[PDB]
Design a protein around this ligand. Structure first.
Ligand SMILES: O=c1[nH]c2cc(C(F)(F)F)c(N3CCOCC3)cc2n(CP(=O)(O)O)c1=O
Ligand SMILES: O=c1[nH]c2cc(C(F)(F)F)c(N3CCOCC3)cc2n(CP(=O)(O)O)c1=O
Lengths: 365, 320, 50, 49
């Protein structure tokens, strides 16, 4: 949402045609540096690369080196290869590589929604004590006579004269099961009230430690080239996986990657720039979210031709804007305020209720 | 009797179940923080910054919605939510049992999280975007070279490597982070276990009565019939006498309030510093407590009437 | 059969009880707008002026 | 210092020729960028909880 075509752009002209983070950032920079400007879109529509053969710069970085433009106000990454040919002001927005997964909160009954309230460890002990009572009663009452009795005490076990001994056993065992079934009921009610559904875990290291959930990056870009050249422990393994993962875990465009995450039911994760990711999270149907911190530290900056007059002024302007919280304000305006999705609002929405069949089904089988 | 007793236990077990549910429902309601907006939306958990520094001056000058409210709170929060040094702030978080949060630079915070006893953790993303850099005198020769050097180091992942070396690797903890993974998140065996021990205890008691019972059978009581009557009579008389002693116990309730107050149904007493005790003999206690509590008359005193009746009934029973 | 069927109905009646408790707990959770601040804290109910 | 208008610490030792370079967790602020030169950030941070 840095630079976009306004709704009625056809009925507008000049700089009024465009709107976005950088569009506002331009006006701010121009105000503190004192100058009029004309917003122009780069021809080839590229950022700033260098063809090895022709040794020619393209995109905005190019239009700067060849005198086509006076300044570049866009999400231009501050890279060493560019800092050599042009000048970058201090970062007006720090970012990095992030992880994108499907929308949290799911379902699933698998009679396993009955063993959860009551822990697997508890179901076990209640069974051990179960046969632990049917064996104690079995000692109360030749080889077959013990089998018929063991089957009778197992029927006295499968739950529902005055031999005081085994009498208090039936009473205590009843009080025991009473507490348990009461606990199960109470706990299940808590579950049916709050009903919070967590998810996996944010930590690139989590993607490497598992394989169930596939993941990849863009087939071409700094994101992919990052893992390839990265000598870091975690990122190394990740690349090794993606490098030979079949089918291809890499996508053609960013839209394809997001679509793959929205159609894999949480089986595919997509790695991309945090900036674009955070924005996607604020777009319908609000089914994507960023997890964990960034993998690296990058940053965009205002690019100006080497040895320019606007150099120092713009640099200070960026620092001034950030300290006035104007930069943070702008981001909030285009990312969250102008957004449409919601996370802290979906958790603040106290409302829901309805029984299904999933859980109950497990008890039928 | 069996019907009423059944209806009685029905209500109790229903109460136990219902009550146990609220403690589990609320146990799930609990939602730790995660963002700065969470600190503003609540007040139970206090929070502050360093009494002097860019951190404090940030909130003061910040015109952002969330950070504004936060400053408004900290600006007039009592006692002082601001600390003298960073060490004091961390100590306040470690000694408040999670009732106090401290706002500081992420860099120093991340480091603290990797230090014993590993009882602190950073939550949510940063509130603003800053950055350290290599400073060189204006118009210096090392200017451009160093600048490029920093960019080169970062692209080679050398910077990230260095941080990992001194922040995470240098640890250490390195253990407190593997336990902070936040795996568990359900009920538990603890409570249920207590009911298992009382079960086995009941089984053991029965295994004892079984053998005991057998022994008794073998033996086969007539001696008790003769001395049992006398024994039971004196036991009853002893119980009645002690019931009367219990009711007069110059200590039916003590309402500490450091002095020391202890009362029964007849006297209200007080032990003053140091040791001297005085009593206000009143005899039993219905007074002007506007209790009622909605009928007419009966208590206080009602307990007097029940105790007196009990002793009279016990005397008639002992005699007969 | 009688034992398993008993354990089956036990779970169901427990589920019914627990779920029914939730329908009343949430029924109380619901709060109605009392002031303006209530209009800002929520989004379900739209609002506007002239 | 507002009164004496004197720089202190590392930033000071740079302006008054005491040192040639400052390698430390020095925050890149506007007030400092005016008197000295800051290389690109070698570590991005912020305020945390
Ligand atoms: O200067 C650069 N600025 C960039 C800014 C952005 C965006 F975040 F969208 F603003 C992106 N995207 C991130 C998500 O995927 C779609 C496009 C790529 C950029 N690239 C290409 P890189 O070589 O992959 O870094 C640059 O070169
Ligand atoms: O350039 C600066 N760099 C700084 C770097 C750090 C650290 F993170 F420790 F490296 C700190 N601390 C953060 C935690 O509290 C103890 C010291 C203060 C710094 N300050 C002082 P400010 O005025 O409060 O910002 C600067 O001026």
């Amino acid at each position: 949402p840095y630079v976009m075509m306004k709704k009625n752009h056809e009925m507008l002209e000049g700089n009024e045609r465009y709107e976005g983070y950088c569009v506002d950032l331009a006006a701010e920079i121009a105000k503190h540096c004192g100058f009029k400007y004309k917003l122009t879109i780069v021809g080839d529509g590229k950022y700033g690369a260098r063809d090895a053969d022709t040794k020619i710069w393209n995109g905005m970085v190019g239009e700067l080196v060849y005198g086509k433009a006076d300044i570049a106000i866009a999400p231009l990454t501050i890279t060493l290869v560019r800092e050599e040919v042009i000048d970058f002001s201090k970062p007006f927005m720090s970012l990095g590589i992030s992880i994108m997964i499907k929308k949290p909160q799911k379902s699933k009954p698998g009679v396993f929604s009955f063993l959860d309230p009551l822990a697997y460890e508890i179901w076990m002990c209640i069974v051990f004590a179960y046969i632990g009572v049917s064996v104690v009663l079995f000692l109360v009452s030749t080889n077959e006579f013990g089998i018929f009795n063991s089957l009778w005490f197992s029927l006295g076990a499968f739950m529902q004269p005055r031999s005081l001994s085994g009498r208090i056993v039936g009473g205590v065992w009843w009080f025991f099961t009473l507490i348990i079934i009461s606990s199960y009921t109470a706990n299940l009610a808590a579950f049916l009230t709050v009903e919070r559904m967590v998810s996996p875990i944010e930590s690139a290291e989590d993607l490497s430690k598992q394989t169930e959930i596939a993941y990849g990056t863009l087939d071409s870009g700094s994101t992919k080239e990052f893992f390839r050249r990265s000598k870091i422990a975690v990122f190394d393994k990740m690349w090794t996986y993606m490098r030979s993962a079949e089918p291809s875990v890499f996508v053609r465009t960013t839209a394809e990657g997001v679509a793959r995450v929205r159609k894999s039911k949480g089986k595919y994760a997509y790695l991309l720039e945090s900036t674009m990711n955070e924005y996607i999270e604020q777009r319908k149907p609000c089914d994507t979210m960023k997890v964990g911190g960034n993998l690296d530290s990058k940053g965009y900056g205002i690019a100006t031709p080497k040895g320019s007059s606007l150099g120092t002024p713009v640099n200070l302007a960026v620092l001034k804007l950030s300290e006035q919280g104007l930069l943070d304000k702008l981001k909030n305006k285009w990312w969250y305020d102008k957004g449409e999705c919601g996370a802290k609002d979906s958790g603040s929405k106290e409302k829901t209720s309805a029984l299904s069949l999933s859980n109950v089904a497990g008890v039928f089988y | 009797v069996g019907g009423v007793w059944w209806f009685f236990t029905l209500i109790i077990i229903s109460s136990y179940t219902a009550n146990l549910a609220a403690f589990l429902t609320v146990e799930r309601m609990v939602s730790p923080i995660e963002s700065a907006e969470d600190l503003s939306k609540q007040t139970e958990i206090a929070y502050g910054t360093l009494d002097s520094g860019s951190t404090k001056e940030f909130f003061r000058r910040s015109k952002i919605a969330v950070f504004d409210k936060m400053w408004t709170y900290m600006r007039s929060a009592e006692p002082s939510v601001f600390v003298r040094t960073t060490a004091e702030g961390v100590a306040r978080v470690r000694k408040s049992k999670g009732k106090y949060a401290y706002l500081l630079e992420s860099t120093m915070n991340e480091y603290i999280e990797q230090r014993k006893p590993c009882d602190t953790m950073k939550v949510g993303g940063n509130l603003d975007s800053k950055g350290y850099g290599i400073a060189t005198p204006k118009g210096s020769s090392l200017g451009t070279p160093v600048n490029l050097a920093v960019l080169k180091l970062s692209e080679q992942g050398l910077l990230d490597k260095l941080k990992n070396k001194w922040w995470y690797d240098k640890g250490e903890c390195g253990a407190k982070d593997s336990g902070s993974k936040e795996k568990t998140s359900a009920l538990s065996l603890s409570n249920v276990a207590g009911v298992f021990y009382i079960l086995v205890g009941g089984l053991g008691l029965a295994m004892l009565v079984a053998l005991i019972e057998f022994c008794y059978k073998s033996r086969a009581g007539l001696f008790d019939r003769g001395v049992q009557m006398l024994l039971t009579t004196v036991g009853a008389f002893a119980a009645f006498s002690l019931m009367t002693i219990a009711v007069g116990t110059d200590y039916w309730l003590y309402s500490r309030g450091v002095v020391m107050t202890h009362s029964g149904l007849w006297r209200t007493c007080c032990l003053e510093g140091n040791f001297k005790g005085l009593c206000k003999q009143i005899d039993h206690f219905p007074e002007d407590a506007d209790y009622e509590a909605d009928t007419a008359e009966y208590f206080l005193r009602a307990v007097r009437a029940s105790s007196i009746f009990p002793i009279l009934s016990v005397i008639l029973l002992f005699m007969g």
